[PDB]
Amino acid sequence: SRYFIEFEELQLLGKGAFGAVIKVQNKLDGCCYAVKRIPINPASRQFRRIKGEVTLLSRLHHENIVRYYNAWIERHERPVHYLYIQMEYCEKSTLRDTIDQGLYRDTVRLWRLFREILDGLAYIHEKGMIHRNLKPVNIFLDSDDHVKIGDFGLIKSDPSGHLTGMVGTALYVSPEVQGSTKSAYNQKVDLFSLGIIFFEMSYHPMVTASERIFVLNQLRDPTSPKFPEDFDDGEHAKQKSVISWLLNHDPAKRPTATELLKSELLPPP
Amino acid sequence: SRYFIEFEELQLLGKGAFGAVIKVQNKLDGCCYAVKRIPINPASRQFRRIKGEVTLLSRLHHENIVRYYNAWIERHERPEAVHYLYIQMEYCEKSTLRDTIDQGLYRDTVRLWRLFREILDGLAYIHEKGMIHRNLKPVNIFLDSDDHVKIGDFGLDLIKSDPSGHLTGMVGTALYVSPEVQGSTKSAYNQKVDLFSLGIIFFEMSYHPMVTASERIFVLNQLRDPTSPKFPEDFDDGEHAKQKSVISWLLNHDPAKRPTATELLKSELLPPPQM
Numbered sequence: 349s350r351y352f353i354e355f356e357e358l359q360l361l362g363k364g365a366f367g368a369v370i371k372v373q374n375k376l377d378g379c380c381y382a383v384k385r386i387p388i389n390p391a392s393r394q395f396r397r398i399k400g401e402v403t404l405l406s407r408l409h410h411e412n413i414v415r416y417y418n419a420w421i422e423r424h425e426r427p428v429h430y431l432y433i434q435m436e437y438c439e440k441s442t443l444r445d446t447i448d449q450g451l452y453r454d455t456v457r458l459w460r461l462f463r464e465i466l467d468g469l470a471y472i473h474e475k476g477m478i479h480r481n482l483k484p485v486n487i488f489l490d491s492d493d494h495v496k497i498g499d500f501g502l503i504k505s506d507p508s509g510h511l512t513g514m515v516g517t518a519l520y521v522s523p524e525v526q527g528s529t530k531s532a533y534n535q536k537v538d539l540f541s542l543g544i545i546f547f548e549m550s551y552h553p554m555v556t557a558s559e560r561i562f563v564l565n566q567l568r569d570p571t572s573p574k575f576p577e578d579f580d581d582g583e584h585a586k587q588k589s590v591i592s593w594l595l596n597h598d599p600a601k602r603p604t605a606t607e608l609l610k611s612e613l614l615p616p617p
Numbered sequence: 618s619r620y621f622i623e624f625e626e627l628q629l630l631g632k633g634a635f636g637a638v639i640k641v642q643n644k645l646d647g648c649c650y651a652v653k654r655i656p657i658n659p660a661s662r663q664f665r666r667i668k669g670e671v672t673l674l675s676r677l678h679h680e681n682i683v684r685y686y687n688a689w690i691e692r693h694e695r696p697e698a699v700h701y702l703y704i705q706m707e708y709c710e711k712s713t714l715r716d717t718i719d720q721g722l723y724r725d726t727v728r729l730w731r732l733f734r735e736i737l738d739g740l741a742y743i744h745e746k747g748m749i750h751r752n753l754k755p756v757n758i759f760l761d762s763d764d765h766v767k768i769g770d771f772g773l774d775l776i777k778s779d780p781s782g783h784l785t786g787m788v789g790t791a792l793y794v795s796p797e798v799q800g801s802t803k804s805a806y807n808q809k810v811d812l813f814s815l816g817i818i819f820f821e822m823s824y825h826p827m828v829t830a831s832e833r834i835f836v837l838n839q840l841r842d843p844t845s846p847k848f849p850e851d852f853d854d855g856e857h858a859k860q861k862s863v864i865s866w867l868l869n870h871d872p873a874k875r876p877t878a879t880e881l882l883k884s885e886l887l888p889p890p891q892m
C-alpha cells in the first residue's frame with residue numbers, strides 16, 4: 349500500500365460521509381499534503397462521479413485553486429477499495445478560521461482575499477464548471493496569505509431552543525437547487541455561496557450558534573433580505589451592494605464572476 | 618410488406634426520434650444492407666423534406682459516400698394506419714469512425730491523415746454538387762472491409778449527462794454544429810457548417826480516446842470556446858503541429874475564415890498521399 353509506505357500521517361484535517369482528509373508528509377520530498385481518502389465501489393455510479401471529478405480537477409490550473417498532486421486507487425484486505433487524492437496543504441489555516449479571528453477589521457485584506465476567490469471562481473467558470481462546494485471550510489490560505497479554493501465533494505444545534513431555519517452547509521446552498529422546486533444547478537449557484545461567504549468575511553465573528561442561525565437565515569430571506577443593525581449602509585455600503593447582488597433570489601439577476609471583477613463596486617488591485 | 622418478405626433483420630445499428638437503422642440481408646442476392654426505417658405521414662411538409670433528401674441522396678456517386686440501393690414507402694398495421702419510408706443503403710463491414718477514434722486512431726499518423734483526406738474527397742463532391750451535409754459526425758461516417766471512409770446519409774446550465782455533476786455546456790450532437798447555426802441564425806446554412814464539424818471530427822481523430830463522459834464533455838467544449846479555442850495540453854507539436862494548424866483553420870468562429878473542402882486538399886498543411 350503506497351499510502352502507508354510513502355506517506356507519514358500527521359493530523360486529521362476533516363471527516364464525514366465522503367470519508368476523510370489527512371495532513372500527511374511524503375517520506376521522500378518531505379512536504380506536507382492534504383490526501384483525501386474516499387472508500388469506493390469501483391462498479392458503482394459513485395465511482396463514475398469521483399473518477400469524473402479527478403479528471404476535471406487534474407485539468408484545473410490556477411493560482412487561486414488548491415493544487416492537485418496525484419490520485420490513485422488502493423484495494424484493502426477482508427474487513428474493499430479506497431481512492432486517494434493528494435492535494436496541496438495550505439499552511440495558513442482555512443477561510444473559516446480567518447473569519448473567526450477578525451478578518452472584518454482589515455478592509456484592505458478583506459477585499460483582496462474576496463477578489464482572489466473571484467479570480468479562481470472565474471477560472472473554474474470559464475472552463476465551464478460548477479463547484480457546488482464553495483463554503484469557508486473548503487477555501488484556504490497559504491504561507492503568503494493567498495486564497496486557495498478547495499476541491500469539490502427545529503434546530504438541535506441552537507442552545508436557546510427557539511430557532512428554526514437551515515443550518516450548516518445548507519445555508520450556502522442556493523434556493524433554486526432546494527425543496528420540491530428544484531430549478532436546475534447553474535454557475536449562478538456558486539455566486540450565491542460567495543455572497544454568504546463575503547458577508548461573513550465583512551462581518552464580526554458570530555460567537556453564539558443562536559446569533560449565527562438568526563443572522564444568516566435572515567440574510568437568506570426572499571421576503572426580507574436582512575443585514576444586521578451593526579452592518580450599516582454607511583461604513584460598508586459597497587460591501588452591502590456586492591452581497592445583495594450575489595444573494596438576489598433570481599438566479600438570473602446575479603452577476604457572473606467576470607461581471608463582478610469588471611464592476612466599479614470592487615476596489616482596484 | 619416488401620421489407621418483411623424480401624429482407625431478413627440481423628441487427629439494429631442505431632435508433633432515435635427520426636426512426637432507426639437496421640442491418641438487413643436480402644434473401645435474393647445474399648447481401649447485407651443498412652435499411653433506415655422512418656415513420657412518416659405523406660400529407661405533412663416533413664415528408665416533402667424527406668422525399669427531397671431521397672431525391673438528392675440518389676444523385677450522389679463517390680467511393681467515399683455510403684452507396685444508395687433503393688427507397689420505398691410501406692403502409693403497415695391497422696388501428697389510424699401507420700406509414701413508413703425505407704431507404705436501403707450500403708453496409709460497411711469494419712466499423713464506424715467513432716469506434717476507430719475510441720480504439721486509438723491518434724497513434725497511426727499514416728491512417729489518420731489518409732482517412733481524413735478520404736472524408737475531404739467525399740465532402741468536396743457533396744459540395745461540388747451544390748449540397749450541404751448537416752450530419753457530419755463520427756457515428757455517421759463508417760469504414761468498410763477495405764478500411765475506407767464512407768460518409769453516411771443526411772437524416773434531418775448543468776448537463777445531466779455528466780457523471781461528476783459539475784460540467785456546463787454542449788453535449789452530444791450540438792458539439793459538431795457550427796456556432797452560426799445555434800443562437801443567432803442569419804446564414805445558418807452554408808457549406809462551411811460541414812467544414813466546422815470536420816474540425817471537431819479531425820480533433821478527436823488526432824487526440825487520444827476520451828472514454829470518460831466528463832473528459833469528452835470538457836475537452837470538446839474547451840475547443841468550441843468562441844472567446845478562446847482551448848486545445849488540450851496533452852496534444853504535442855513534435856508528433857503533430859500541422860494537425861493543430863488544420864483543426865484551427867476549420868474551427869474559425871467566423872465561417873468566412875474556414876477553408877472550402879477543395880481549398881484544404883490544395884493546402885500544404887495536408888501531407889500528400891503515397892498509396
Ligand SMILES: CN1CCN(c2ccc3[nH]c(-c4c(N)c5c(F)cccc5[nH]c4=O)nc3c2)CC1
Nearest residue numbers: 361369382414435436437438439441442445498
Ligand atoms: C481550529 N482550526 C481547525 C482547522 N485548521 C486547519 C489548519 C490547516 C488546514 N489545511 C487544510 C486543508 C484542507 N482541509 C484541504 C482539503 F480539505 C482539500 C484539499 C486541500 C486541502 N488543503 C489544506 O491545507 N485544512 C486545515 C484546517 C486550523 C485550526
Ligand SMILES: CN1CCN(c2ccc3[nH]c(-c4c(N)c5c(F)cccc5[nH]c4=O)nc3c2)CC1
Nearest residue numbers: 630638651683706707708709712713716769770
Ligand atoms: C465497432 N462497432 C461495431 C458494431 N457497430 C456498427 C458496425 C458497423 C456499422 N455499419 C453501420 C452503418 C450505418 N449506421 C449506416 C447508416 F446509419 C446510414 C446509412 C448507411 C449505413 N451503413 C452502415 O454500414 N453502422 C454500424 C455499427 C458499432 C461499431
